Design a protein around this ligand. Structure first.
Ligand SMILES: C[C@H](OP(=O)(O)OC[C@@H](O)[C@@H](O)[C@@H](O)Cn1c2nc(=O)[nH]c(=O)c-2cc2ccc(O)cc21)C(=O)N[C@@H](CCC(=O)N[C@@H](CCC(=O)O)C(=O)O)C(=O)O
Ligand SMILES: C[C@H](OP(=O)(O)OC[C@@H](O)[C@@H](O)[C@@H](O)Cn1c2nc(=O)[nH]c(=O)c-2cc2ccc(O)cc21)C(=O)N[C@@H](CCC(=O)N[C@@H](CCC(=O)O)C(=O)O)C(=O)O
Ligand code: NA
Lengths: 142, 138
């Protein structure tokens, strides 16, 4: 951990990269917007929420190629890049992802995303929510 | 042109596998060489440079030496969500502690980043041969 508040810096950033494992164990990367929920009690883990944008579809037809549901281990990285290399920093969060189609976690993820991103005033939230339980934080600065 | 967009971007995220199989992520500056040779994969180079670090024996190198399979992502983010795009390169990485690929990587890095003009590079270079490209734009 570098000497800044890594969780706040990660939380305040608008975009992160999400890494999941393919079926054959190879890495896979997608960008995400997200919102961090900081623990209520000391010792409890942070959780990170991201929603998947969904078009209206049949309940059991369309399929997703990549797997979280098969392997749940994920990592998320926020980088602050600048052409001025003195201003570089990053924060990584490693954890376990769970996909939710209804229930508390969907409601919580939509609410937190709406609170963070003004854009969701005009972009609907209709898809499933991935919740990541963070087990390790790392950070670095220039 | 996904490949050119990726190549021109200043930074990417690199994913490697830890010993236990779990994903590891670190940001990188990089340079892409597309050979002008039919069937040759694109090659991405990144180095262990002078940005502050405690060791040159970084975790991502140990990972690559264990399991060569990597992915790298360029994201183009904007507050205007109409301007979003990303490009992902999946491939096979090799670490180089000496030899031709070290000099090739340093040279391509310097050609792209003015910031490296006056930096002495002497850490290892990773080269990645891309097996697949993927892309999306808003
Ligand atoms: O394959 P796939 O991973 O289903 O494809 C995903 C793409 O098609 C595209 O819909 C998503 O990447 C769009 N997208 C997001 N799509 C989402 O559904 N949710 C997100 O949080 C999200 C964030 C995001 C950030 C940057 C960016 O460039 C794109 C983003
Ligand atoms: C021990 C070591 O830590 P360190 O000396 O603090 O490493 C700091 C480097 O990651 C740091 O110099 C680079 O990220 C800087 N850096 C670049 N550094 C470069 O050398 N080359 C680049 O192209 C580069 C680009 C870049 C762009 C954006 C940015 O924000 C930073 C960038 C290490 O192994 N680092 C890892 C990342 C941290 C890590 O994984 N640590 C372990 C714990 C340490 C251990 O394994 O015991 C963990 O969290 O599991 C690595 O770089 O692969
Ligand atoms: Na709370």
């Amino acid at each position: 951990m570098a000497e800044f508040d890594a969780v706040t810096a990660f939380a305040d950033a608008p975009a992160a990269v999400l890494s999941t494992l393919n079926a054959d164990g190879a890495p896979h990367l997608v960008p995400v917007v997200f919102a961090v929920h900081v623990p209520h009690v000391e010792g409890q883990p942070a959780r990170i929420y991201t929603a998947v944008d969904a078009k209206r579809k049949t309940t059991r037809n369309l399929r997703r190629l990549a797997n979280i549901d098969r392997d749940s281990r994920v990592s998320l990285l926020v980088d602050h890049y600048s052409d001025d290399w003195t201003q570089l920093w990053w924060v990584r969060a490693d954890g376990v992802a769970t996909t939710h189609h209804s229930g508390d976690e969907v409601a919580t993820g939509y609410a937190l995303l709406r609170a963070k991103y003004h854009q969701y005033e005009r972009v609907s939230l209709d898809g499933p929510v991935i919740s990541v339980e963070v087990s390790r934080w790392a950070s670095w600065q220039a």
